[PDB]
Structure 1
Amino acid sequence: MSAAITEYMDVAQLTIWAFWFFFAGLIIYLRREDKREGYPLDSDRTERSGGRVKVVGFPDLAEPKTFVLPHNAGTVMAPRVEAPTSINATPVAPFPGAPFEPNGDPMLSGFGPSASPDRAKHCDLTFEGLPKIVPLRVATDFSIAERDPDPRGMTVVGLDGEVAGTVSDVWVDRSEPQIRYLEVKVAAGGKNVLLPIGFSRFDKKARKVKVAAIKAAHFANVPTLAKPDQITLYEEDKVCAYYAGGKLYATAERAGPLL
Protein backbone atom coordinates (compact mmCIF):
# COMPACT_ATOMS: atom_id res chain seq x y z
CA MET A 1 0.00 0.00 0.00
CA SER A 2 0.99 3.70 -0.29
CA ALA A 3 -0.27 7.26 0.15
CA ALA A 4 -1.03 7.79 -3.55
CA ILE A 5 -4.38 6.37 -4.68
CA THR A 6 -4.06 7.76 -8.21
CA GLU A 7 -1.72 10.32 -9.78
CA TYR A 8 -3.85 12.95 -7.99
CA MET A 9 -5.89 11.07 -5.40
CA ASP A 10 -4.19 10.41 -2.07
CA VAL A 11 -5.21 8.89 1.25
CA ALA A 12 -5.73 12.21 3.05
CA GLN A 13 -8.02 13.42 0.27
CA LEU A 14 -10.00 10.19 0.59
CA THR A 15 -10.18 10.53 4.38
CA ILE A 16 -11.56 14.08 4.22
CA TRP A 17 -14.18 13.05 1.66
CA ALA A 18 -15.14 10.10 3.86
CA PHE A 19 -15.72 12.54 6.71
CA TRP A 20 -17.99 14.70 4.55
CA PHE A 21 -20.25 11.72 3.86
CA PHE A 22 -20.38 10.77 7.54
CA PHE A 23 -20.93 14.40 8.51
CA ALA A 24 -23.79 14.71 6.02
CA GLY A 25 -25.42 11.68 7.62
CA LEU A 26 -24.81 13.13 11.08
CA ILE A 27 -26.44 16.45 10.17
CA ILE A 28 -29.42 14.59 8.71
CA TYR A 29 -29.63 12.55 11.92
CA LEU A 30 -29.36 15.63 14.15
CA ARG A 31 -31.98 17.58 12.19
CA ARG A 32 -34.35 14.61 12.43
CA GLU A 33 -33.76 14.57 16.20
CA ASP A 34 -34.45 18.33 16.29
CA LYS A 35 -37.84 17.69 14.67
CA ARG A 36 -39.22 15.42 17.40
CA GLU A 37 -40.93 18.54 18.83
CA GLY A 38 -43.13 21.04 17.03
CA TYR A 39 -43.49 19.12 13.76
CA PRO A 40 -45.33 18.97 11.39
CA LEU A 41 -45.25 22.75 11.21
CA ASP A 42 -48.23 25.06 11.69
CA SER A 43 -48.33 26.56 8.20
CA ASP A 44 -50.65 28.29 5.79
CA ARG A 45 -49.40 25.70 3.29
CA THR A 46 -51.22 23.02 5.30
CA GLU A 47 -54.22 25.28 5.95
CA ARG A 48 -55.10 26.00 2.32
CA SER A 49 -54.37 22.39 1.37
CA GLY A 50 -56.95 21.24 3.94
CA GLY A 51 -54.30 19.32 5.87
CA ARG A 52 -53.28 17.34 2.78
CA VAL A 53 -49.70 18.71 2.82
CA LYS A 54 -47.84 18.27 6.11
CA VAL A 55 -44.97 20.75 6.40
CA VAL A 56 -41.92 18.88 7.70
CA GLY A 57 -39.02 20.16 5.59
CA PHE A 58 -35.93 18.06 5.07
CA PRO A 59 -35.20 15.61 6.60
CA ASP A 60 -38.67 14.21 7.32
CA LEU A 61 -39.76 13.23 10.81
CA ALA A 62 -38.32 10.29 12.73
CA GLU A 63 -40.29 7.35 14.06
CA PRO A 64 -41.63 8.09 17.56
CA LYS A 65 -39.23 7.26 20.38
CA THR A 66 -40.47 6.21 23.81
CA PHE A 67 -39.83 7.98 27.12
CA VAL A 68 -40.93 5.77 30.02
CA LEU A 69 -41.50 8.07 32.97
CA PRO A 70 -40.47 7.14 36.53
CA HIS A 71 -42.98 6.20 39.23
CA ASN A 72 -45.51 5.04 36.61
CA ALA A 73 -46.16 8.62 35.54
CA GLY A 74 -46.70 7.25 32.03
CA THR A 75 -45.02 6.98 28.65
CA VAL A 76 -44.55 9.88 26.24
CA MET A 77 -43.66 9.72 22.56
CA ALA A 78 -41.16 12.40 21.54
CA PRO A 79 -42.72 12.85 18.07
CA ARG A 80 -46.39 13.01 19.04
CA VAL A 81 -49.58 14.27 17.45
CA GLU A 82 -50.77 17.39 19.26
CA ALA A 83 -54.29 18.79 19.04
CA PRO A 84 -54.42 22.35 17.66
CA THR A 85 -54.76 25.03 20.33
CA SER A 86 -56.69 28.24 19.73
CA ILE A 87 -54.89 31.51 20.47
CA ASN A 88 -56.43 34.35 22.48
CA ALA A 89 -55.21 36.84 19.89
CA THR A 90 -56.04 38.20 16.46
CA PRO A 91 -53.70 39.14 13.59
CA VAL A 92 -52.71 42.79 13.49
CA ALA A 93 -52.68 42.57 9.67
CA PRO A 94 -53.91 39.99 7.14
CA PHE A 95 -50.59 39.23 5.45
CA PRO A 96 -48.57 36.07 6.21
CA GLY A 97 -45.97 36.54 8.91
CA ALA A 98 -47.94 39.32 10.59
CA PRO A 99 -47.97 39.30 14.41
CA PHE A 100 -51.06 38.92 16.59
CA GLU A 101 -52.53 41.31 19.12
CA PRO A 102 -53.73 39.69 22.37
CA ASN A 103 -57.44 39.84 23.15
CA GLY A 104 -58.69 41.44 26.35
CA ASP A 105 -56.22 42.31 29.07
CA PRO A 106 -52.83 41.18 27.69
CA MET A 107 -51.61 40.11 31.13
CA LEU A 108 -54.60 37.73 31.31
CA SER A 109 -54.68 36.74 27.63
CA GLY A 110 -52.37 33.74 27.89
CA PHE A 111 -50.79 34.91 24.63
CA GLY A 112 -47.32 36.04 23.65
CA PRO A 113 -44.88 36.13 26.57
CA SER A 114 -47.79 35.19 28.84
CA ALA A 115 -48.54 32.03 26.82
CA SER A 116 -47.66 28.55 28.05
CA PRO A 117 -48.45 24.96 27.05
CA ASP A 118 -50.65 22.78 29.23
CA ARG A 119 -48.21 20.49 31.00
CA ALA A 120 -49.23 17.41 32.97
CA LYS A 121 -51.35 18.07 36.05
CA HIS A 122 -48.92 16.12 38.23
CA CYS A 123 -46.10 17.29 40.46
CA ASP A 124 -42.50 16.69 39.50
CA LEU A 125 -41.24 13.93 41.77
CA THR A 126 -38.02 13.22 43.61
CA PHE A 127 -36.24 9.89 43.13
CA GLU A 128 -38.16 8.63 46.18
CA GLY A 129 -41.57 9.66 44.78
CA LEU A 130 -42.17 12.74 46.91
CA PRO A 131 -43.16 16.07 45.31
CA LYS A 132 -40.03 17.96 44.33
CA ILE A 133 -41.10 21.60 44.72
CA VAL A 134 -42.53 22.10 48.21
CA PRO A 135 -42.74 24.88 50.79
CA LEU A 136 -40.19 25.04 53.59
CA ARG A 137 -43.07 24.31 56.00
CA VAL A 138 -43.32 20.75 54.65
CA ALA A 139 -39.63 20.25 53.77
CA THR A 140 -38.69 20.61 57.42
CA ASP A 141 -35.12 19.31 56.99
CA PHE A 142 -34.31 22.15 54.57
CA SER A 143 -33.05 25.53 55.73
CA ILE A 144 -31.61 28.80 54.50
CA ALA A 145 -27.82 29.01 54.67
CA GLU A 146 -26.58 31.04 57.64
CA ARG A 147 -24.61 33.54 55.54
CA ASP A 148 -27.62 34.35 53.38
CA PRO A 149 -30.70 36.31 54.51
CA ASP A 150 -33.96 34.49 55.09
CA PRO A 151 -36.42 35.50 52.34
CA ARG A 152 -39.33 34.99 54.73
CA GLY A 153 -40.63 38.33 55.99
CA MET A 154 -39.14 40.38 53.15
CA THR A 155 -41.35 42.98 51.49
CA VAL A 156 -42.21 42.11 47.88
CA VAL A 157 -42.12 45.18 45.63
CA GLY A 158 -43.51 45.40 42.11
CA LEU A 159 -41.93 47.04 39.11
CA ASP A 160 -43.31 50.47 40.07
CA GLY A 161 -41.81 50.34 43.58
CA GLU A 162 -45.20 49.99 45.25
CA VAL A 163 -45.35 47.27 47.89
CA ALA A 164 -47.00 44.09 46.61
CA GLY A 165 -46.90 41.89 49.71
CA THR A 166 -44.64 39.91 52.01
CA VAL A 167 -42.80 36.60 51.67
CA SER A 168 -44.67 34.01 53.72
CA ASP A 169 -42.76 30.86 52.76
CA VAL A 170 -39.99 29.66 50.47
CA TRP A 171 -40.55 26.79 48.05
CA VAL A 172 -37.45 24.64 47.58
CA ASP A 173 -36.39 21.92 45.17
CA ARG A 174 -35.95 18.74 47.21
CA SER A 175 -33.77 17.06 44.57
CA GLU A 176 -31.24 19.84 44.00
CA PRO A 177 -31.58 22.01 47.13
CA GLN A 178 -32.39 25.52 45.90
CA ILE A 179 -35.14 28.13 45.96
CA ARG A 180 -37.59 27.92 43.08
CA TYR A 181 -40.58 29.96 44.28
CA LEU A 182 -41.39 32.62 46.86
CA GLU A 183 -44.83 32.40 48.44
CA VAL A 184 -46.10 35.99 48.68
CA LYS A 185 -48.92 37.13 50.94
CA VAL A 186 -50.53 39.70 48.65
CA ALA A 187 -51.10 43.03 50.39
CA ALA A 188 -54.39 43.75 48.61
CA GLY A 189 -56.27 40.46 48.87
CA GLY A 190 -54.23 38.30 51.21
CA LYS A 191 -54.46 35.21 49.01
CA ASN A 192 -51.06 33.56 48.74
CA VAL A 193 -49.46 33.51 45.29
CA LEU A 194 -46.19 32.07 44.06
CA LEU A 195 -43.33 34.16 42.65
CA PRO A 196 -40.58 32.35 40.72
CA ILE A 197 -37.04 33.02 41.89
CA GLY A 198 -36.13 33.93 38.31
CA PHE A 199 -38.35 37.02 38.55
CA SER A 200 -37.11 37.98 42.04
CA ARG A 201 -34.18 40.35 42.56
CA PHE A 202 -33.10 40.35 46.21
CA ASP A 203 -32.13 43.57 47.99
CA LYS A 204 -30.30 42.17 51.01
CA LYS A 205 -29.75 45.55 52.69
CA ALA A 206 -33.35 46.75 52.34
CA ARG A 207 -34.86 43.28 52.95
CA LYS A 208 -36.92 43.78 49.79
CA VAL A 209 -37.72 41.49 46.88
CA LYS A 210 -37.98 43.52 43.68
CA VAL A 211 -40.11 42.11 40.86
CA ALA A 212 -39.54 44.07 37.65
CA ALA A 213 -41.87 41.83 35.64
CA ILE A 214 -45.22 43.02 37.01
CA LYS A 215 -46.69 45.82 39.09
CA ALA A 216 -47.97 45.39 42.63
CA ALA A 217 -51.55 45.33 41.33
CA HIS A 218 -50.71 42.51 38.92
CA PHE A 219 -49.93 40.15 41.81
CA ALA A 220 -53.63 39.61 42.55
CA ASN A 221 -54.07 37.77 39.22
CA VAL A 222 -51.17 35.32 39.56
CA PRO A 223 -52.52 31.79 38.92
CA THR A 224 -53.20 29.98 42.18
CA LEU A 225 -52.33 26.45 43.28
CA ALA A 226 -54.92 23.71 43.67
CA LYS A 227 -53.23 22.15 46.68
CA PRO A 228 -51.47 24.58 49.05
CA ASP A 229 -48.36 22.44 49.66
CA GLN A 230 -47.46 21.28 46.14
CA ILE A 231 -47.42 22.49 42.54
CA THR A 232 -48.02 20.51 39.36
CA LEU A 233 -45.91 20.88 36.24
CA TYR A 234 -48.96 22.49 34.63
CA GLU A 235 -49.26 25.06 37.42
CA GLU A 236 -45.52 25.81 37.33
CA ASP A 237 -45.78 26.84 33.68
CA LYS A 238 -48.91 28.91 34.33
CA VAL A 239 -47.26 30.88 37.14
CA CYS A 240 -43.96 31.54 35.35
CA ALA A 241 -45.69 32.49 32.09
CA TYR A 242 -47.89 35.04 33.87
CA TYR A 243 -44.90 36.98 35.21
CA ALA A 244 -43.19 36.77 31.81
CA GLY A 245 -46.19 38.44 30.20
CA GLY A 246 -45.43 41.45 32.37
CA LYS A 247 -42.04 41.92 30.72
CA LEU A 248 -44.00 43.00 27.63
CA TYR A 249 -47.49 43.89 28.90
CA ALA A 250 -47.20 45.39 32.40
CA THR A 251 -46.36 48.93 31.23
CA ALA A 252 -47.31 50.55 27.95
CA GLU A 253 -43.74 51.63 27.20
CA ARG A 254 -42.54 48.02 27.55
CA ALA A 255 -44.15 47.33 24.16
CA GLY A 256 -41.61 49.62 22.49
CA PRO A 257 -40.13 50.90 20.31
CA LEU A 258 -37.47 52.92 22.15
CA LEU A 259 -37.33 55.72 19.59
Structure 2
Amino acid sequence: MVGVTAFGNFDLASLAIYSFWIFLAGLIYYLQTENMREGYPLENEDGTPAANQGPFPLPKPKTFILPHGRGTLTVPGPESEDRPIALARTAVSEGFPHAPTGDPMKDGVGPASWVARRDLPELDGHGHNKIKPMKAAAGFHVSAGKNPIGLPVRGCDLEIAGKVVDIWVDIPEQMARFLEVELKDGSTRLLPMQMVKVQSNRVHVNALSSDLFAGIPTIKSPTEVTLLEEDKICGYVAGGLMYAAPKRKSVVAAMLAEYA
Protein backbone atom coordinates (compact mmCIF):
# COMPACT_ATOMS: atom_id res chain seq x y z
CA MET A 1 0.00 0.00 0.00
CA VAL A 2 2.72 2.46 -0.99
CA GLY A 3 1.15 5.78 -1.91
CA VAL A 4 -2.43 4.74 -1.08
CA THR A 5 -4.07 7.80 0.50
CA ALA A 6 -7.65 8.01 1.74
CA PHE A 7 -7.66 11.79 1.22
CA GLY A 8 -5.00 14.36 0.45
CA ASN A 9 -1.66 13.08 1.71
CA PHE A 10 -3.39 11.19 4.55
CA ASP A 11 -2.29 7.56 4.20
CA LEU A 12 -1.77 4.67 6.60
CA ALA A 13 1.29 6.44 8.03
CA SER A 14 -0.68 9.65 8.64
CA LEU A 15 -3.50 7.61 10.17
CA ALA A 16 -1.01 5.92 12.48
CA ILE A 17 0.66 9.18 13.52
CA TYR A 18 -2.62 10.95 14.29
CA SER A 19 -4.01 7.94 16.15
CA PHE A 20 -0.80 7.90 18.16
CA TRP A 21 -1.20 11.59 18.99
CA ILE A 22 -4.68 10.77 20.30
CA PHE A 23 -3.33 7.79 22.23
CA LEU A 24 -0.50 9.88 23.68
CA ALA A 25 -2.92 12.55 24.88
CA GLY A 26 -5.03 9.86 26.51
CA LEU A 27 -1.97 8.24 28.07
CA ILE A 28 -0.73 11.55 29.48
CA TYR A 29 -4.18 12.13 30.96
CA TYR A 30 -4.14 8.66 32.51
CA LEU A 31 -0.62 9.05 33.89
CA GLN A 32 -1.37 12.44 35.44
CA THR A 33 -4.58 11.18 37.03
CA GLU A 34 -2.61 8.25 38.45
CA ASN A 35 -0.04 10.70 39.83
CA MET A 36 -2.88 12.64 41.47
CA ARG A 37 -3.44 9.95 44.13
CA GLU A 38 -1.29 11.64 46.80
CA GLY A 39 -1.32 15.20 48.09
CA TYR A 40 -4.75 16.07 46.70
CA PRO A 41 -7.04 18.00 46.89
CA LEU A 42 -4.82 21.06 46.93
CA GLU A 43 -4.95 23.34 49.96
CA ASN A 44 -4.32 26.97 50.76
CA GLU A 45 -1.43 28.03 52.97
CA ASP A 46 -3.88 28.11 55.89
CA GLY A 47 -5.31 24.63 55.28
CA THR A 48 -8.62 25.23 53.53
CA PRO A 49 -9.20 23.70 50.07
CA ALA A 50 -7.94 25.91 47.26
CA ALA A 51 -10.15 27.39 44.57
CA ASN A 52 -7.77 26.04 41.91
CA GLN A 53 -7.54 22.25 41.71
CA GLY A 54 -5.95 21.78 38.29
CA PRO A 55 -7.26 20.78 34.88
CA PHE A 56 -6.86 17.08 35.68
CA PRO A 57 -9.58 15.75 38.00
CA LEU A 58 -9.02 13.30 40.82
CA PRO A 59 -9.07 9.61 39.87
CA LYS A 60 -11.57 7.19 41.30
CA PRO A 61 -10.19 5.75 44.56
CA LYS A 62 -8.27 2.48 44.58
CA THR A 63 -7.56 0.21 47.55
CA PHE A 64 -4.22 -1.38 48.41
CA ILE A 65 -4.51 -4.41 50.67
CA LEU A 66 -1.46 -3.96 52.87
CA PRO A 67 0.64 -7.04 53.69
CA HIS A 68 0.73 -8.84 57.04
CA GLY A 69 -2.75 -7.69 58.02
CA ARG A 70 -1.77 -4.02 58.15
CA GLY A 71 -5.20 -3.01 56.87
CA THR A 72 -5.98 -1.19 53.63
CA LEU A 73 -5.08 2.13 52.04
CA THR A 74 -7.57 3.93 49.80
CA VAL A 75 -6.16 6.64 47.53
CA PRO A 76 -7.15 9.34 46.92
CA GLY A 77 -8.56 9.67 50.42
CA PRO A 78 -8.83 12.05 53.36
CA GLU A 79 -5.25 12.68 54.49
CA SER A 80 -4.02 15.14 57.11
CA GLU A 81 -0.69 15.95 58.71
CA ASP A 82 -1.81 14.45 62.05
CA ARG A 83 0.84 16.59 63.77
CA PRO A 84 1.12 20.25 64.81
CA ILE A 85 3.17 22.31 62.36
CA ALA A 86 5.33 24.92 64.11
CA LEU A 87 5.37 27.41 61.25
CA ALA A 88 4.23 31.02 61.06
CA ARG A 89 3.13 32.81 57.91
CA THR A 90 5.68 35.41 56.79
CA ALA A 91 3.27 37.17 54.41
CA VAL A 92 -0.49 37.45 53.96
CA SER A 93 0.03 36.78 50.25
CA GLU A 94 0.49 33.17 49.21
CA GLY A 95 3.69 31.82 47.73
CA PHE A 96 6.08 32.91 50.49
CA PRO A 97 8.11 30.87 52.99
CA HIS A 98 6.77 30.03 56.44
CA ALA A 99 9.23 30.78 59.21
CA PRO A 100 9.72 28.26 62.03
CA THR A 101 8.26 29.46 65.31
CA GLY A 102 10.80 27.63 67.47
CA ASP A 103 13.70 25.27 66.80
CA PRO A 104 12.92 23.71 63.39
CA MET A 105 14.94 20.55 64.06
CA LYS A 106 12.94 19.91 67.23
CA ASP A 107 9.72 21.13 65.59
CA GLY A 108 10.20 18.80 62.62
CA VAL A 109 9.54 21.46 59.99
CA GLY A 110 11.42 22.39 56.84
CA PRO A 111 14.25 20.09 55.79
CA ALA A 112 13.90 18.50 59.25
CA SER A 113 10.30 17.50 58.56
CA TRP A 114 8.89 14.06 59.27
CA VAL A 115 5.62 12.29 58.49
CA ALA A 116 3.25 10.69 60.98
CA ARG A 117 3.51 7.15 59.63
CA ARG A 118 2.52 3.88 61.30
CA ASP A 119 4.26 3.40 64.65
CA LEU A 120 5.00 -0.22 63.72
CA PRO A 121 8.16 -1.91 62.45
CA GLU A 122 8.59 -2.52 58.75
CA LEU A 123 8.08 -6.21 57.99
CA ASP A 124 9.71 -8.45 55.40
CA GLY A 125 7.92 -11.03 53.27
CA HIS A 126 8.00 -13.62 56.06
CA GLY A 127 6.57 -11.16 58.61
CA HIS A 128 9.70 -10.58 60.68
CA ASN A 129 11.21 -7.16 61.29
CA LYS A 130 12.95 -5.87 58.17
CA ILE A 131 15.62 -3.79 59.96
CA LYS A 132 17.37 -5.44 62.90
CA PRO A 133 20.62 -4.84 64.77
CA MET A 134 23.42 -7.03 63.47
CA LYS A 135 23.85 -8.56 66.94
CA ALA A 136 20.23 -9.79 66.79
CA ALA A 137 20.47 -10.82 63.12
CA ALA A 138 21.43 -14.48 62.84
CA GLY A 139 24.63 -14.97 60.86
CA PHE A 140 25.00 -11.39 59.65
CA HIS A 141 28.49 -9.91 59.68
CA VAL A 142 30.50 -7.24 57.89
CA SER A 143 31.67 -8.81 54.63
CA ALA A 144 33.68 -6.03 52.95
CA GLY A 145 34.77 -2.45 53.44
CA LYS A 146 35.93 -0.69 56.56
CA ASN A 147 34.09 -2.00 59.61
CA PRO A 148 32.58 1.07 61.34
CA ILE A 149 32.04 -0.66 64.69
CA GLY A 150 34.33 0.90 67.29
CA LEU A 151 35.20 3.99 65.25
CA PRO A 152 34.69 7.46 66.73
CA VAL A 153 31.93 9.59 65.24
CA ARG A 154 32.90 13.14 64.30
CA GLY A 155 30.31 15.87 63.80
CA CYS A 156 30.33 18.72 61.32
CA ASP A 157 32.11 20.86 63.94
CA LEU A 158 35.07 18.42 63.94
CA GLU A 159 34.27 17.19 67.46
CA ILE A 160 33.79 13.55 68.44
CA ALA A 161 30.23 12.86 69.57
CA GLY A 162 30.34 9.13 70.32
CA LYS A 163 31.39 5.77 68.98
CA VAL A 164 29.72 3.22 66.72
CA VAL A 165 28.46 0.25 68.74
CA ASP A 166 26.32 -1.72 66.29
CA ILE A 167 25.06 -1.81 62.71
CA TRP A 168 21.36 -2.10 61.87
CA VAL A 169 20.91 -4.21 58.75
CA ASP A 170 18.01 -4.80 56.37
CA ILE A 171 17.55 -8.57 56.44
CA PRO A 172 16.12 -9.08 52.91
CA GLU A 173 18.30 -6.47 51.19
CA GLN A 174 21.34 -7.52 53.29
CA MET A 175 22.64 -3.95 53.41
CA ALA A 176 23.41 -1.69 56.35
CA ARG A 177 20.74 0.90 57.12
CA PHE A 178 21.55 2.49 60.49
CA LEU A 179 24.66 2.87 62.61
CA GLU A 180 23.97 2.78 66.33
CA VAL A 181 26.11 5.45 68.00
CA GLU A 182 26.74 5.69 71.74
CA LEU A 183 27.06 9.30 72.89
CA LYS A 184 28.97 10.72 75.86
CA ASP A 185 26.00 10.18 78.20
CA GLY A 186 25.78 6.44 77.50
CA SER A 187 22.55 6.58 75.50
CA THR A 188 22.44 5.39 71.89
CA ARG A 189 21.12 7.11 68.77
CA LEU A 190 20.65 5.90 65.21
CA LEU A 191 22.31 7.43 62.15
CA PRO A 192 21.23 6.63 58.58
CA MET A 193 24.06 4.99 56.65
CA GLN A 194 23.47 7.45 53.80
CA MET A 195 24.32 10.41 56.07
CA VAL A 196 27.61 9.05 57.47
CA LYS A 197 30.97 8.84 55.70
CA VAL A 198 32.90 5.84 57.00
CA GLN A 199 36.57 6.83 56.81
CA SER A 200 39.65 4.83 57.76
CA ASN A 201 39.79 6.05 61.37
CA ARG A 202 36.51 7.85 62.13
CA VAL A 203 32.92 8.03 60.92
CA HIS A 204 32.23 11.56 59.69
CA VAL A 205 28.68 12.93 59.96
CA ASN A 206 28.58 16.17 57.98
CA ALA A 207 24.87 16.70 58.68
CA LEU A 208 24.98 17.03 62.48
CA SER A 209 27.31 18.82 64.85
CA SER A 210 28.40 16.96 67.98
CA ASP A 211 26.10 18.86 70.35
CA LEU A 212 23.11 17.96 68.15
CA PHE A 213 23.70 14.21 68.47
CA ALA A 214 21.85 14.21 71.79
CA GLY A 215 18.82 15.76 70.08
CA ILE A 216 18.33 12.82 67.70
CA PRO A 217 14.98 11.12 68.39
CA THR A 218 15.32 7.82 70.21
CA ILE A 219 13.80 4.41 69.54
CA LYS A 220 11.35 3.14 72.16
CA SER A 221 12.64 -0.43 71.68
CA PRO A 222 16.37 -1.29 71.62
CA THR A 223 15.80 -4.18 69.19
CA GLU A 224 13.25 -2.77 66.71
CA VAL A 225 12.67 0.56 64.99
CA THR A 226 9.29 1.65 63.64
CA LEU A 227 8.54 3.61 60.48
CA LEU A 228 7.69 6.70 62.53
CA GLU A 229 10.99 6.53 64.41
CA GLU A 230 12.90 6.03 61.16
CA ASP A 231 11.19 9.07 59.66
CA LYS A 232 11.89 11.22 62.72
CA ILE A 233 15.56 10.21 62.85
CA CYS A 234 16.11 10.73 59.12
CA GLY A 235 14.31 14.07 59.15
CA TYR A 236 16.35 15.31 62.11
CA VAL A 237 19.66 14.25 60.56
CA ALA A 238 18.85 15.72 57.14
CA GLY A 239 17.53 18.98 58.59
CA GLY A 240 20.85 19.25 60.38
CA LEU A 241 22.31 20.03 56.95
CA MET A 242 20.52 23.39 56.78
CA TYR A 243 20.08 24.07 60.50
CA ALA A 244 23.54 23.12 61.79
CA ALA A 245 25.21 25.25 59.10
CA PRO A 246 26.53 27.84 61.62
CA LYS A 247 28.27 25.07 63.57
CA ARG A 248 29.76 23.46 60.46
CA LYS A 249 33.48 24.25 60.12
CA SER A 250 33.78 24.12 56.33
CA VAL A 251 36.64 26.27 55.03
CA VAL A 252 34.77 27.38 51.90
CA ALA A 253 31.78 28.29 54.07
CA ALA A 254 34.06 30.27 56.40
CA MET A 255 35.59 32.20 53.50
CA LEU A 256 32.15 32.91 52.01
CA ALA A 257 30.89 34.13 55.39
CA GLU A 258 33.99 36.33 55.60
CA TYR A 259 32.69 38.33 52.62
CA ALA A 260 28.98 37.96 53.47
Q: TM (normalized to structure 2)?
A: 0.90
Give the conservation status (yes or no) of the 8 Å contact 1:40–1:55.
no
Q: Secondary structure at the match of 2:123?
A: coil
CA positional deviation for 1:98? 0.9
> In structure 2, what is the equivalent of residue 110 of structure 1?
108
Amino acid aligned to 2:186: G
| Aligned residue identity for 1:3 | V
SS in 1 for 2:95: coil
Counterpart pick for 1:195 among 191, 194, 200: 191
Structure 1 residue 107, shift from structure 2 partner: 2.0
AA aligned to 1:43 is N
Q: TM-score, normalised by structure 1?
A: 0.90
In structure 2, what is the Cα distance between the partners aligned to 1:34 and 1:104?
A: 34
- Supply the distance in 1 between the matched residues of 2:137 and 2:69 (Cα, whole angstroms): 24
Q: How does 1:151-190 map to 2 (within 5 A)?
A: 151-187=148-184, 189-190=185-186
Aligned counterparts, 1:204-215, within 5 A: 204=200, 206=201, 208-215=202-209
Q: Deviations over 1:171-195 (max 9, x none)?
A: 00001000000000012x2211001
Question: Could you tell which deviates more after superposition, 95-104 or 223-232?
Answer: 95-104
CA distance in 2, matches of 1:179, 1:79: 34
Q: Which amino acid aligns with 2:228?
A: Y
Residues 43 and 55 in structure 1, CA contact (< 8 A), matched pair in contact too: no
Partners of 2:170 and 2:176 within 8 A in 1: yes
Q: Which residue of 2 aligns with 1:21?
A: 22
8 Å Cα contact 1:45/1:55 also seen in 2 = no
Q: Which secondary structure does the structure 1 equivalent of 2:228 belong to?
A: helix
In structure 1, what is the Cα distance between the partners aligned to 2:25 and 2:84?
Answer: 38
Q: What stretches of structure 1 move > 6 A for 4+ residues in a row?
A: none
TM-aligned CA deviation for residue 253 of structure 1: 8.1
Q: Is the 8 A contact 1:134 1:173 kept in 2?
A: yes
Q: How many residues align?
A: 250
The CA RMSD measured in Å over matched residues stands at 2.1
Q: Is the 8 A contact 1:132 1:173 kept in 2?
A: yes
Say which SS state the counterpart of residue 53 (structure 2) adopts: coil
- DSSP 3-state at the match of 1:28: helix
Which 5+ residue runs of structure 1 have no aligned equivalent? Answer: none
Superposed CA offset, 1:186-229 (max 9, x none) = 12x2211001001100112x2x1100001000000100001110
Closer, same or farther: CA 54–212 of 1 in aligned 2, 3 Å? same
CA distance in 1, matches of 2:91, 2:163: 43
Q: CA deviation at 1:83?
A: 2.6
Could you tell me which residue of structure 2 aligns to residue 99 of structure 1? 97
